[PDB]
Design a protein around this ligand. Structure first.
Ligand SMILES: COC(=O)N[C@H](C(=O)NN(CCC[C@@]1(Cc2ccccc2)C(=O)N([C@H]2c3ccccc3C[C@H]2O)C[C@H]1O)Cc1ccc(-c2ccncc2)cc1)C(C)(C)C
Lengths: 99, 99
């Protein structure tokens, strides 16, 4: 579908069998999610945002649906006011910018 | 044209008689640029991104040339580690997300 930007591009995602609201963010290299439970082991990562750096838990090869589109990739769990879907997953669903 | 997201969507804009590189960011409500001078009135505010909040100066009705388009919008000026073009300006050039 085509999503205009007059409002925040919030969509529904599904991860771990649960539905959550997330923001499609072309300015993010990675996908950052609010605290939640994920399987397996995690690795450390330090990411930088507009306000500074934060530590997150990196989980790999995690199944996740975005607007009904299936993806499997890396998700980072840490302190954020909203779930952010970055380019690592936007490319998996074939998302592009157009004008 | 169509912009894929395999790489960061960087563009060159013209503002205040200056040329700056900026990231097309669908997650940003408004454009945020590193310290620079802008004419007109402004009001201070705090924006909270990943890593915490930063203080910025909000300028409205600022002329900006982007992707061959002469648009007008709001610009937040402050200590951001990266320049980003937000929805406030992206809408004016008819930019949309598609997948
Ligand atoms: C390479 O790094 C990244 O891609 N980082 C991601 C990120 O923040 N990307 N920024 C781009 C994305 C910004 C949003 C992320 C967001 C955060 C919380 C809740 C919802 C959305 C951000 O900070 N936003 C805030 C914003 C902006 C304008 C006006 C108001 C407000 C309030 C917030 O919503 C919205 C997005 O634009 C650009 C950027 C690139 C490099 C460095 C860096 C580089 C090197 N050293 C230091 C900093 C700092 C910033 C992230 C999400 C993975 C942390």
């Amino acid at each position: 579908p085509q999503i205009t930007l007059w409002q925040r591009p919030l969509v529904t995602i599904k991860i771990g069998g649960q539905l959550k609201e997330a923001l499609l963010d072309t300015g993010a290299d990675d996908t950052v999610l609010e605290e939640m439970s994920l399987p397996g082991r995690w690795k450390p990562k330090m990411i930088g945002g507009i306000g500074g750096f934060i530590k997150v838990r990196q989980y790999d090869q995690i199944p996740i649906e975005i607007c009904g589109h299936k993806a499997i990739g890396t998700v980072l769990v840490g302190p954020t006011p909203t779930n952010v879907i970055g380019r690592n997953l936007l490319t998996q669903i074939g998302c592009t910018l157009n004008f």
